[PDB]
Design a protein around this ligand. Structure first.
Ligand SMILES: Nc1ncnc2c1ncn2[C@@H]1O[C@H](COP(=O)(O)O)[C@@H](O)[C@H]1O
Ligand SMILES: O=P(O)(O)OC[C@H]1O[C@H](OP(=O)(O)O)[C@H](O)[C@@H]1O
Ligand SMILES: O=P(O)(O)OC[C@H]1O[C@H](OP(=O)(O)O)[C@H](O)[C@@H]1O
Ligand SMILES: O=P(O)(O)OC[C@H]1O[C@H](OP(=O)(O)O)[C@H](O)[C@@H]1O
Ligand SMILES: O=P(O)(O)OC[C@H]1O[C@H](OP(=O)(O)O)[C@H](O)[C@@H]1O
Ligand SMILES: O=P(O)(O)OC[C@H]1O[C@H](OP(=O)(O)O)[C@H](O)[C@@H]1O
Ligand SMILES: [K+]
Ligand SMILES: [K+]
Ligand SMILES: [K+]
Lengths: 322, 322, 322, 322, 322, 322
C-alpha cells in the first residue's frame, strides 16, 4: 500500500511522545486516518480500504498501553469496514473515513469539556487538589472549578521520568490557578493537607482498575489511607473492551535513557538494569469515582460503560483486519 | 571566640550536602570539634571551653532534621563540660575533646558494621530488596548478606530531588550486587516482586516513628500493603531524646532549585510555589523492625533505647550551653 | 399567585420537623400539591399550572438534604407539566395533579411494606439488631422479622440532638419487640454483641454513598470493623438523580438550640460555636446491602437504580420551572 | 407418580456426594429429568407433567446450597410448564423435557470451556496459582493456561474433610501441571509465593458474595491481605436468584462421620459435638473478579447477571409446584 | 470504727459524680483519709489503723472503673501499713497518713501540669483538636498550647449522657480558646477537619488499652481511619496494676435515669431496657501516644510504667486488708 | 564418648513426635541430661562434662523450631559449664547437672499452672473460646477458667496433618468442658460466634512474632478481622534469644507421608510435591496479649523478656560447645 507521510510522521511522534496524553494520541490517529483518506491516490474502493487497514496497523503499533488509540481506529474503521462491505464506491468510502474521523475528534473535545463540567461540581471552594502527570481530562475539571470562582490550589507532582508535571504546573498557573509543585516522593507528606485527588487514565478495565502514569497507584493508595477522594477523569473511550474477555493490559516499558540520559548511562556498569514502566495499575477499591462524559460512576460500573458501548464489537475481529 | 577554618568549612559542607547521610555528618561534626581542640591557640581552659561551645553551636545550626549531628556534639561536649567543671586544666580539657571525638567516630564505624552483621541474618538467599536514598547502615546490611554468598538483587529508587539513589546504585554494583534502578513512582508496581525493604534513618522518635528521606513513608506504606518486611537500619544515635518530652522533629525544607534548576525556575511564573521537604515521617505500624548495633527491636522499643542511653541528659541543658 | 393554607402549613411543619422522616415528608409534599389542586379556584389551566409551580417551589425550599421530597414533587409535576403542555383543560389538569399525587403516596406505602418483607429474610432468629434514628423503612424490616416469629432484640440509639431514638424505642416496644436503649457513644461498645445493623436513608448517591442521620457513618464504620452486616433500607425515591452529573448533596445545618436549649446557650461565651449537621455521609465500602422495593442491591448498584428510573429527566429543567 | 429408578439413583448419589461439584450435580439433575421423560409410560400429558414435578422435587431435596441444581431444574421445568399449559400433547411435552435437559447439559459444558478461555488470559507465564477443593470451572482455567504454553504451578489445598484436593492434584498432574500439595492451614504461609488465587462457586448472591467449599473465605481473606488476585470461575447458573429478594443461602451441614470416621467417633464422650459445614461465605471485598461464560465482572455485578437472566422468574412460583 | 463524716460525704459525692474526673476522685480519696487521720479520736495505733482500713474500704467501694482511686488509697495505705507494722506510735502513724495523703495530692497536681507541658509540644500552631468528656489532663495540654501562643481551636463533643462536654466547652472558652461544640454522633463527620485528638483516661491496662468515657473508642477508631493522631493525656496512677496478672477492668454501669430522666422513664413499657455504661475500651492500635508526667510513650509501653512503679505490690494483699 | 540408652530414646521420640508439645520436649530433654548424669560411669569431671556436651548435641539436633528445647539444654548446661570451669569435682558436677535439670522441670510445671491462673482472668462466663493444636499452656487457661465456674465452650480445630486437635478435644471434654470440633478450614466461618482465641507457642521472636503450629497465623488473621482477642499462652522459655541479633527461626519441614500416607503417595504422579511445614509465623499486630508466668504482656514486650532473661548469654558460645 501507498501510505502518506503524515501517517508515518504521526506514528513516529506518538512513539517518541512528542504527541502524548491518551486522548490526544487517539485524536492524532483519527486525524492521520483522515489525511490518508484525503490524500489517497487510490482508484478502486479496495485500494483505499487496503491503505486504511495498513495505516491503522501502523498506528496501533506505536504505544500499546492506552486503549484510547485503538478505540479511535475502531471508531473509524468499523464504519469504513461496513461501508466497504456494503459495496460502497470510492468517494463514499473516502468520505466515510474522513467523516468518522472528524466525528471522533469532535466527540473527544466535547467529552473532555463535559467531564470538566461534571467533575467541577465535586470541587468545593477552598479545596486543595493533588494531581499526577498531565491529563487534559483532569485539568478540565480543575480549570472549570476555578472558572466557577472557587479558590483552589493545585498540588502537582513532577511525574518522573518524563516530567509531565512541568506541563501541568505551567498550564494551570497560566489560567491563574495557584500551583504547589513537589517531587512524587512527597505525595504522602502532603496528603494530609489535600482535600481531593484528580487524575486521568490511559485504560480502564472491566473490573474498575485504572491504568495511568507510573505513580498513580501510590498516590491513590495514600489518598485512601487518608480518606481523600480519588477521582478519575476519563472519556468513555479510555475503557478497554478486550478486558471484558480476560485480556490483560500491557504495561509499556520505555527507553532507560528517559531515566538516565545516554551520556551518563553509558558510564554505568553492566550489572545495573534501569526499568522504566510508563504506567501502573490502580485497583478499584482505591477509586471513589470515575468521571466520564456520561456522568459519575463508581469504578465497578466500568463494566456497564463497556457492555453498553463496546461489547457488541468483541464477537468480530478488529476492523482493520483480514 | 577564635574558631578554626575547618569548623566553618565543615558547617558549610554539611549545609550544602556535599557531606551528607546522617551518620557521616555526625562524624564530621565530631571531627570538626576534634580539630578545633587540636589547633586551638587558647591558653586558659575557659578560652578553649568557649571555642568548643561556639563551634558546637555553629555545627548544630547546619541541618536540623537528623538528630545524629546533635547527639555527636553532645557525646563530646557532655564529657568536655564535666571535665571543665571538674576544674580540668588546658591540656586535660583539649584531650578530653579530642578523645571523646575519636571515640564517637570509632563507635559510629563499629555500630554500622555490626548493623551489617545483624541485619544480614534477616536477608535470605534469592531475596529481592528494595531500598531508598543512600544509607550506609542499610547498605552495610545488603553488602554483608551478599558477602555471605546469598544471591540478592537490589531495587534502588532514584530518590528525587537530589538523586542519592545514583550513589547507591553505583556503590552496590561496585561490590558485585545486581541492581535494578527505578524512579520513586515505581515503588508500588515493584512491591509485588520485592521480598524485603531496607532503609536508613535520620531520627527516630520515642514512639517508634522514623524520619528519613522524603518518600520513605510511601515505600513503607505499600510495603505494609503487600506484607513485605520493612526493616530500618539505624545506629542508636539516630534516636531522638527530645521527643521523650514531647518535642516534634523539624522537617528540613531545602532550596527549590534542587527541584527546578535556577536557569529554568526563574522563567516560571510567581504563582507556582516549589516545596522541597527533605524528609517525611513513617509511622511505627509500618515498620517490622529497627536494626541497631544492640540488636533487633520492634519500632515501639525505641523508647527503651532512649530511656536507657539518653534520658538522663534531658534534666540538664545542652552541653554547649551557658 | 394564590396558595392554599395547607401548602404553607405543610411547608412550616417540614421546616420545624413536626413532620419528619424522609419518606414521610415526601408523602406530605405530594399531599400538599394534591390539596392545592383539590381546592384551587383557578378557572383556566394556565392559572392552576402556575399555582402548582409555586406550591412546588414553596415545598422544595423547606429542607434540602432528603432527595425524597424533590422526587415526590417531580413525580407529580412531570405528569402535571406534560398534561399542561399537551393541552389539558382545567379539570384534566386538576385530575392529573390529584392522581399523580395519590399514585406517589400509595407507591410509597407499598414500597415500605415490600422493603420490610425483603429485608426481613436477612434477619435470623435470635438476631440482635442495632439501628439508628427513626426510619420507617428500617422499622418495616424489624417489625416484619418479628411477625415471622424470629426472636429478635433491637438496640436503639437515642440519636442526638433531636432524640428520634425515643420514637423508635416506643414504636418497636409497642409491637412486642424487646429494646435496648443506649446513647450514640455506646455503639462500638455494643457492636460486639450485635448481629446486624439496619438503618434508613435520606439520600443515596450515584457512587453508592448513603446520607442519613448524623452518627450513621460512625455506626457503619464500627460495624465494618467488627464484620457486622450494614443494611440500609431505602425506597428508590431516596436515590439522588443530580449526583449522576456531579452534584454534591447539601448537608443540612440546623439550629444550635436543638443541641443547647436557648435558655442555656444565651449564657455561654461568644467564642463557643454550636455546629448541628443533621446528616452525615457513609461511604459504600461500609454498606453490605441496600434493600429497595425492587430488591437487594450492593451499594454500587445505586447508579443502576438512577439510570433506569431518573436519568431521563436530567436533560430537562425541573418540572416546576418556567 | 411412577418415578424411574434413575431419578432415585441420581438423588441418592447427589446426597452421598458420589456425584459432586456444583455444575456436575446440575447436569446430573437435568439428565435425570431427561430420562424420566424418555422412559415415562404416561398416556396423558397431565400424567407426564406430574411425574416431572415429582422428580424435580426429589432432585431438589438432595443438597441445598448449590443453586446450580434448582437452576437446572428450572431451566427444564419452566419450558415443560409453558408447553403443558399451552396445551401440548403427550409427545410434544416429552420432547420439550428431553430437549430442554439436553440444552442445559450442552450449555453447561460450553460455558465451562469458555470460562477456561476467558480466565486463562488472566494467567501469565510463571504464575504460581493457589486453588481450593475441586472445581471444574477453576480447573478449566488452569488447564487452558498451561495449553497456551504458560509455565504454571498450582498449589492445591487438600480440602478437608472430604479431601477433594486429592482429585484436583491428580487431575492437574495428569495434564502436565506441577502441583504443590498442602494442608488447608498452610494457605497463609504460602500466600507470599502465590501470584493468583482461582477457585469455584456453588452459589453467588445478589450482593456479590460467593458461597463455596468450607475454607474458601479464609484463603480469600489472606489473599487480600497479601494483594493476591482472587478470581472466582463460575457459570451464570451459579448465580442465586432468590437472593435478589432477600433470601439467605442455606449452608449444608453434613454428617459428622466425614470428619471423624464412625468407628472412632462412637468412642468419643457425648460432650464433644462435631460440626461440619460444607460451605462458607466469602464477601465481595475479597474477590477481584468473577469469570463467567459471558466475561469478567466485578463481584458487585452479580446483580446484573441476575437481573438480566433470572429476575423475570421471581413473580412466579417454582415451575415444579402445584 | 469511728468514721468521720468527711469520709462518708466524700464517698457519697464520688458515687453521685458531684465529685468526678479520675484524678480528681483520687485526690479526694487521699484527702478524705488525711482528714480521718487529722480528726481521729483514736488512743492506740491499732485503733487509728483500723479506722484507716475501714475508710479506705468505704472509699474503694464508690466507683470501680478508674484505677486512680485504688492507687491513691494504696499510696497512702502502703505507707500507713509499713509504719503500723514497723511499730510506729499513735502520732507517728497519724503523721504518716496525713503526709502520705499530702504527697499524693501534690504529686497529682504537678503531674497534670507536667503532662500539659509535654503534650503542648506536640500541638502546633493552627491545630484543630478534638477532645471528648472533661479531662483535666487533656485540658492542661490544650491550655498550655494556647499559652505558648499557638492559635488552636477545639472541637468538644457533648459527651452524653452526663454532658461533661459542657464543662469542657465553658472551661476552654474561659481561657481564650475557641470551641466548636458538637454531638457525639458528629465526630466522624468532623474528623476530616481535625488535626489532633487529645483525650484522657480512667484506667490504662498492661497491654496498652485505655478505658475512658463512653464513646472514646469510637472517636479513636475514626481518628485512625483518618490518620489523625490520637494522644491520651494520663498520669502514671491511671495505670492499672492488677491487669499485669490478667485482671479485667470492670465497666461501671450507671443508673438508667441519667439517660432518660425518672419522670419520662416511668412512663415507658417494661420491654425497653436502658443500658448506661460509663466507659469503653480503646485498643492500643488506635492510640499514637500516651503523655504521662514522665514523658511520651507508645501505648505498648504501659507495661513498663507498671513494671517499674507498681508491679512490686502484686505479691502482697491490698494494704487496707486484714 | 559414652551415652546412655535414655538419651538416644528421648531423641528418637522427639523426632518421631511420640513426645511433642514445645514445653514437653523441653522437659524431656532436661530429663535426658538428668539421667545421663544419674547413670554415667565417668570417673573424672572432664569425662562427664564431655558426655553432657555430647548428649546435649544429640538432643538439640532433634527438632529445630521450638526454642524451648535449646533453652532447657542451656538452663542445665550454663550451670554445668560454670561448675566445671570453676573446678567442681565429679560428684559436684553430677549434682549440678541433675539439679539444674530438676529445677527446669519444676519451673516448667509451675510456669504452666501460673499461666493458667493469669489467663483465666481474661476468660468470662459464657465465653466461646477457639483454640488450635494441643498446647498445655493454652489448656491450662481453659481448664482453670472452667474450674472457676465460668460456663465456657471450646471450639477445637482438628489441626492437620497430625490431628493434635483430637488430643485437645478428648482432654478438654474429659475435664467436663463442652467442645465443638471443626476442621481448620471452618475457622472463619465460626469466628463470628467466637469470643476469644487461646493458642500456644513454640518460639516467640524479639519483634513479637509467634511461631506456632501451622494454621495459627490464619486463625489469628481472621480473629483480628472480627475483633476477637488473640491470646498466646507461653512460658518465658518459649522466647527466642538469638532473634535478638537477627537470627531467623527455621520452620520445620516434616515428612510428606504425614499428609498423604505412604501407601497412597507412592501411587501419585511424580510432578506432585507434598510440602508439610510444621509451623507458621503470626505477626505481633494480630496478637492481643502474650500470657507468660510473669504476667500479661503486649507482643512487642517480647524483647523485654529476652533482654532481662537471655541477652546476657549471647556474647558467649553455646554452653555445650568446645
Ligand atoms: N522465620 C522467621 N523467624 C523470625 N521471625 C519471622 C520469621 N518469618 C517471619 N517473621 C516475622 O513475622 C512477621 C511475618 O509476617 P508478614 O509481615 O505478614 O510477612 C514479620 O513481622 C517478621 O519479622
Ligand atoms: O487523556 P488525558 O486525560 O490528557 O491523559 C490521560 C493520561 O495519558 C497520559 O499518558 P502518557 O503521557 O501518554 O504516557 C497520562 O498517563 C495521563 O494521565
Ligand atoms: O546514616 P546513613 O544510614 O548513611 O543515612 C541515613 C539517612 O540520611 C540521609 O539523609 P540526607 O541525605 O543527609 O538528607 C538519608 O535520609 C538516609 O536514609
Ligand atoms: O424515610 P424513613 O425510612 O422513615 O427515614 C429515613 C431517614 O430520614 C430521617 O431524617 P429526619 O428525621 O427527617 O431528618 C432519618 O435520617 C431517617 O433515617
Ligand atoms: O483525670 P482527668 O484527666 O480529669 O479525667 C479522666 C477521665 O475520667 C472521667 O471519668 P468520669 O467523668 O469521672 O466518669 C472521664 O472519663 C475522663 O476522660
Ligand atoms: O508447650 P505447649 O503449650 O504444650 O505447646 C506449644 C506448641 O507446641 C506444639 O508443637 P508440636 O506439636 O510439638 O509440633 C504446638 O505448636 C503447640 O501450640
Ligand atoms: K486530607
Ligand atoms: K512481595
Ligand atoms: K466474634
Amino acid at each position: 500500500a501507498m501510505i502518506v507521510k503524515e501517517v508515518y510522521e504521526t506514528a513516529e511522534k506518538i512513539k517518541s511522545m512528542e504527541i502524548r496524553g491518551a486522548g490526544r494520541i487517539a485524536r492524532a490517529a483519527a486525524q492521520a486516518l483522515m489525511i490518508q483518506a484525503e490524500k489517497s491516490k487510490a482508484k478502486e474502493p479496495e485500494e483505499l480500504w487496503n491503505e486504511l487497514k495498513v495505516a491503522s496497523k501502523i498506528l496501533y503499533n506505536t504505544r500499546p498501553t492506552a486503549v484510547s488509540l485503538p478505540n479511535a481506529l475502531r471508531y473509524v474503521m468499523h464504519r469504513v469496514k461496513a461501508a466497504y462491505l456494503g459495496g460502497a464506491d470510492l468517494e463514499t468510502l473516502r468520505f466515510t473515513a474522513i467523516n468518522s474521523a472528524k466525528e471522533f475528534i469532535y466527540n473527544s473535545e466535547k467529552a473532555i469539556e463535559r467531564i470538566g463540567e461534571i467533575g467541577a461540581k465535586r470541587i468545593e471552594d477552598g479545596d486543595i487538589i493533588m494531581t499526577h502527570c498531565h491529563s487534559k481530562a483532569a485539568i478540565s475539571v480543575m480549570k472549570k472549578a476555578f472558572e466557577q470562582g472557587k479558590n483552589i490550589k493545585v498540588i502537582v507532582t513532577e511525574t518522573r521520568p518524563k516530567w509531565q508535571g512541568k506541563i501541568t504546573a505551567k498550564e494551570l498557573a497560566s489560567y491563574g490557578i495557584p500551583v504547589i509543585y513537589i517531587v512524587d516522593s512527597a505525595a504522602r507528606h502532603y496528603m494530609k493537607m489535600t482535600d481531593k485527588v484528580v487524575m486521568g487514565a490511559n485504560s480502564i478495565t472491566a473490573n474498575g482498575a485504572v491504568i495511568n502514569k507510573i505513580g498513580t497507584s501510590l498516590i491513590a493508595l495514600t489518598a485512601k489511607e487518608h480518606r481523600v477522594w480519588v477521582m478519575i477523569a476519563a472519556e468513555t473511550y479510555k475503557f478497554h473492551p478486550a478486558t471484558m474477555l480476560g485480556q490483560l493490559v500491557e504495561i509499556e516499558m520505555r527507553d532507560p535513557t528517559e531515566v538516565i540520559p545516554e551520556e551518563e548511562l553509558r558510564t554505568w556498569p553492566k550489572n545495573i538494569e534501569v526499568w522504566n514502566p510508563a504506567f501502573d495499575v490502580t485497583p478499584p477499591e482505591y477509586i471513589d469515582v470515575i468521571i466520564t462524559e456520561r456522568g459519575i460512576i463508581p469504578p465497578y460500573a466500568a463494566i456497564d460503560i463497556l457492555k453498553e458501548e463496546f461489547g457488541w464489537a468483541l464477537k468480530y475481529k478488529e476492523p482493520w483486519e483480514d
